[PDB]
Design a protein around this nucleic acid. Structure first.
Ligand SMILES: [K+]
Ligand SMILES: [K+]
Ligand SMILES: [K+]
Ligand SMILES: [K+]
Ligand SMILES: [K+]
Ligand SMILES: [K+]
Ligand SMILES: [Mg+2]
Ligand SMILES: [Mg+2]
Ligand SMILES: [Mg+2]
Ligand SMILES: [Mg+2]
Ligand SMILES: [Mg+2]
Ligand SMILES: [Mg+2]
Ligand SMILES: [Mg+2]
Ligand SMILES: [Mg+2]
Ligand SMILES: [Mg+2]
Ligand SMILES: [Mg+2]
Ligand SMILES: [Mg+2]
Ligand SMILES: [Mg+2]
Ligand SMILES: [Mg+2]
Ligand SMILES: [Mg+2]
Ligand SMILES: [Mg+2]
Ligand SMILES: [Mg+2]
Ligand SMILES: [Mg+2]
Ligand SMILES: [Mg+2]
Ligand SMILES: [Mg+2]
Ligand SMILES: [Mg+2]
Ligand SMILES: [Mg+2]
Ligand SMILES: [Mg+2]
Ligand SMILES: [Mg+2]
Ligand SMILES: [Mg+2]
Ligand SMILES: [Mg+2]
Ligand SMILES: [Mg+2]
Ligand SMILES: [Mg+2]
Lengths: 56, 85, 164, 202
RNA sequence: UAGGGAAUAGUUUAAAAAACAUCUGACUCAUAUUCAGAAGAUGGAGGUUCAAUUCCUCCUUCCCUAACCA
RNA sequence: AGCUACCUAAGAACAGCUAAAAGAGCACACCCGUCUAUGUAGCAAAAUAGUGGGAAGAUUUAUAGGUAGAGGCGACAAACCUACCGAGCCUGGUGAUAGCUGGUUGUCCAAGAUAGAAUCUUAGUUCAACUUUAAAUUUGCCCACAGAACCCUCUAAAUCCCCU
RNA sequence: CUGUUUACCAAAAACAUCACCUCUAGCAUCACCAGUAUUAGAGGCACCGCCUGCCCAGUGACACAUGUUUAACGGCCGCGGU
RNA sequence: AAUUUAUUAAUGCAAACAGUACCUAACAAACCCACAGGUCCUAAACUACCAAACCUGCAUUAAAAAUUUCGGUUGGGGCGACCUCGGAGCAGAACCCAACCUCCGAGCAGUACAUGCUAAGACUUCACCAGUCAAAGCGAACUACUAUACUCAAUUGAUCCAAU
RNA sequence: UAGGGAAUAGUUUAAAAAACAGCAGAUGGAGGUAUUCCUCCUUCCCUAACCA
């Protein structure tokens, strides 16, 4: 319980579609920017971390 | 006379609760009866008398089910008898 | 927003004021709000007082301005000294600030003999000069304005038209 | 007044039938206690002249405590009913045009009462030769006594005053009441000097 | 029989430091006190970690508690 | 509150001896109930015989009244409050509820014994499994070869699959 | 000490008790009381005799600026050597 | 112990209820003025207090109480220990298999960011719930990557409800 | 967890200075137009949550 290493964050598409997916990242690393498939536009686009959902 | 849920949460205890009106002793004057009465009233009664423009109008206008007072109904009979005679 | 500073700003806004002389010929000042407004009339009246209360024809018009020098955000702006010469410099002039920081600024405008139009122009220049510190539309910068001579009481000017 | 509502829904009874009330329908929640509401004013028509509220025929909005506990019981005011409004409205036409005489406004009576019991200190400077005229004297009411006097209303003794002394000013309030106030011409002292000299000293 | 805790210099404590004891010197006629120096330790065994008194495990010594109802 | 606990009003009783002062001693009436035997459906739902404690006092006692069960009263024994008070009695809610025990009424025939899972659950339930009835249409059981692992010490008895 | 108790298995070392002590209260027309701090009430302990030691950190109570208070609840030490 | 303050008491606010008061630190440097004082170098702006109790409403803190509960396994109960998940032996060869039996572990971590979508056929911890593997297809990747349901044994939590 | 606020020398303050602690010494970190403007992150505080 006390131990804490990673966190769950919401990655939001930069295409304006509003599509989001959750990923795990290290707490001590910088905010993630990822290239991920967006179903709305049907092609890989940039995703940027917005909020931390919970501590993993 | 009713019940309440503690902290307005239904999942908490149900308690007995009585809400009492704030009572005031005031003096009123009747034009038709030309007499002053010391009557225990509520702030609502004072508001209703103001909207009727006097005690006489309030007593004469208000139906029995809204007066909710035997004394009020006796005043009505007194005023009506003086008007009738 | 400290309670006292913000509450006074609310209070000073509350002070009532009225347009035109009341109907009554003779009326106690207490019974009616402040009345005299127009900047032109105000200068003319200050000259009238000078004649009635025998005093120097030339006097310093120490316009005191209750300028909301605070409440830009919940964080308040600070007192500075934006120096600009008036259109007709009286016989740059510093816009000094209050020591108590109650937002009133004692800033001479013109000598009494200066023509109403010149004093009116001198007034408008300061209005822009004072807002220079916080010329934001976010927070209103001016509340009240009292145009007083040295030996006369302050008169509540209608500064609202001249604000922008 | 306590206003309550039920926690539990009451089933519809339909036309001409009484609701079926379970014991659960006795559980109430406090919607509002109307004693804590902001107080509204009571609109009354004055019959006599009250010191601060107004004068006969004036529609005044007073605190319910004042009207109920003082004005209405003592006959100073009446309810602003349609009928009373008409009765007083008819009077205000007769006063304006008819035989009924015009009467002071609320402020007029207040000034008259103050002007009856006040003395004007017309401070005049020693250095400059001064002649007392209605306009100069009018200024001193504002500064000293706080009264805003129109220049035309003032009637001076009509003897030119250039020497320190005592005289009389006859003030007319709204054209009906003429008051004669004591006049004390004195050497002018600046506000700061006069307050430090006497108010602070004693 | 069951359960919890503890082990640090010769001694007693601390989170690898102090105190004395021990040794060296100075002061004293000499001793003590004092002053200036010096050394010395993480019960045992095994393992993780670059690094373990400080993370775990078994054993030894000791302490404390429980060992009942008919 | 006709028993009993405490209280209120107004009553009553207390020989003899010692000391003569007594919440003093001896000792009747009277109150209590220490010890033993008897009795144990008894004479008695607490008694009898003897023996004992007290007996002018915080004594005993007749009469009427008061305090009532979420309570009273108590020199606290969890005493006593109409023979049974860890909180009276009666009536009602009430056919309280009981996974617990007991009981469950004519004749005759037939099929019929049981992997387990979860559960404040292991004195019980629900789902599986087994068991019963009716119906549908097609394989069920027994089994020939061939076939189902290396790592590892018992190279086990066997099983699985399976046409005929 | 006399006294009191489990009517119906306990009469006692249990309770009460004179005494001692702590706490609360400055007051009247229904108890207390037709009373007024040498009083009244809430408790502890148990005549008398010699005494009643240390502790207010914790809990409680009181008091507020720290704090006060054990005849309040309670507590009242080790290891090694000579 | 959980839940609660209806009730009682205190305090706060609201509600209700009358009015008493509204504010003073110059100074001439020059000049004027017989004084007393004035001109210039500011003589502005600006209201405060405030009704004791009783009663009612809403809060807060206490007191005194109320309602309800006090898990299971267990070579009787208690004490101790244990309660879910995975690997191995017992259980030698399809599956399954217990003891407060014998041993060792888990309550993550790391790399991806198509751990995208969709869909035949199957497995299944003896029920259910849950869990597991997948051709083809779409879209990607791709003509160097034991590339296509990531490495990994377990590495985990239903419904309601809450947040969004 | 949510916002609010805060961060100066080892420590505590000031507008780049003093005081303590031991002549050294600082503007939590990063980025941008500089303790003094803004932004993200770390640490801490405050306040409210921490239900099912
Ligand atoms: K009785
Ligand atoms: K049986
Ligand atoms: K059962
Ligand atoms: K006895
Ligand atoms: K204490
Ligand atoms: K056994
Ligand atoms: Mg009796
Ligand atoms: Mg008696
Ligand atoms: Mg005798
Ligand atoms: Mg005796
Ligand atoms: Mg005797
Ligand atoms: Mg007794
Ligand atoms: Mg006892
Ligand atoms: Mg007992
Ligand atoms: Mg009985
Ligand atoms: Mg039954
Ligand atoms: Mg058969
Ligand atoms: Mg359960
Ligand atoms: Mg079973
Ligand atoms: Mg076959
Ligand atoms: Mg007995
Ligand atoms: Mg007895
Ligand atoms: Mg006996
Ligand atoms: Mg005793
Ligand atoms: Mg004693
Ligand atoms: Mg003692
Ligand atoms: Mg020895
Ligand atoms: Mg439980
Ligand atoms: Mg059990
Ligand atoms: Mg056992
Ligand atoms: Mg246990
Ligand atoms: Mg299955
Ligand atoms: Mg495929």
């Amino acid at each position: 319980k006390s131990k804490s290493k990673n966190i769950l964050v919401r990655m939001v598409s930069e295409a304006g579609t509003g599509f989001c997916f959750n990923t795990k990242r290290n707490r001590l690393r910088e905010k993630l920017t990822l290239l991920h498939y967006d179903p709305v536009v049907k092609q890989r686009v940039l995703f940027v971390e917005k909020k931390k959902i919970r501590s993993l | 006379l009713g019940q309440i849920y503690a902290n307005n949460d239904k999942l908490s205890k149900r308690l007995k609760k009585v809400w009492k009106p704030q009572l005031f002793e005031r003096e009123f004057y009747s034009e038709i009866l030309d007499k002053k009465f010391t009557v225990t009233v509520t702030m609502r009664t004072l508001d209703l008398i103001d909207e009727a423009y006097g005690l006489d109008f309030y007593i004469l206008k208000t139906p029995k089910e809204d007066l909710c007072s035997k004394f009020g109904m006796d005043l009505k009979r007194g005023m009506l008898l003086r008007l009738a005679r | 927003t400290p309670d006292e500073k913000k509450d006074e700003i609310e209070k000073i806004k509350a002070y009532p004021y009225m347009e035109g002389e009341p109907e009554d010929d003779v009326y106690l000042k207490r019974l009616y709000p402040r009345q005299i407004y127009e900047v032109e009339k105000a200068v003319h009246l200050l000259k009238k007082f000078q004649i009635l209360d025998f005093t120097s024809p030339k006097q310093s018009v120490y316009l005191d301005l209750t300028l909301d020098m605070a409440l830009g955000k919940k964080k308040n702006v600070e007192p500075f000294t934006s120096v600009l010469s008036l259109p007709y410099p009286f016989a740059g002039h510093e816009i000094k600030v209050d020591e108590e920081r109650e937002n009133f600024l004692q800033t001479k405008i013109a000598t009494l003999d200066m023509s109403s139009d010149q004093i009116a122009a001198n007034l408008q220049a300061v209005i822009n000069e004072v807002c220079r510190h916080r010329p934001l539309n976010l927070g209103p910068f001016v509340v009240r304005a009292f145009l007083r001579s040295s030996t006369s009481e302050g008169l509540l000017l209608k500064i609202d038209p001249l604000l922008p | 007044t306590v206003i309550v509502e039920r926690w539990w829904k009451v089933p519809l009874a339909g036309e001409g039938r009484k609701p079926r009330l379970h014991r659960r329908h006795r559980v109430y929640k406090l919607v509002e206690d109307t004693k804590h509401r902001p107080k509204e004013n009571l609109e009354l028509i004055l019959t006599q002249s009250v010191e601060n509220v107004g004068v006969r025929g004036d529609l005044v909005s007073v605190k319910k405590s004042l009207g109920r506990n003082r004005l209405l019981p003592q006959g100073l005011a009446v309810y602003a009913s349609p009928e009373n409004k008409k009765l007083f409205e008819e009077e205000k036409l007769l006063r304006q045009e008819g035989k009924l005489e015009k009467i002071q406004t609320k402020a007029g009576e207040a000034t008259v009462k103050f002007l009856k019991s006040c003395r004007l200190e017309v401070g005049m400077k020693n250095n400059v030769k001064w002649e007392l005229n209605p306009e100069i004297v009018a200024r001193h009411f504002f500064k000293n006594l706080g009264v805003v006097v129109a220049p035309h209303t003032l009637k001076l003794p009509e003897e030119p005053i250039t020497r320190w002394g005592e005289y009389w000013c006859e003030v007319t309030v709204n054209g009906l009441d003429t008051v004669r106030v004591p006049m004390s011409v004195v050497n002018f002292e600046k506000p700061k000097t006069k307050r430090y000299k006497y108010w602070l000293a004693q």
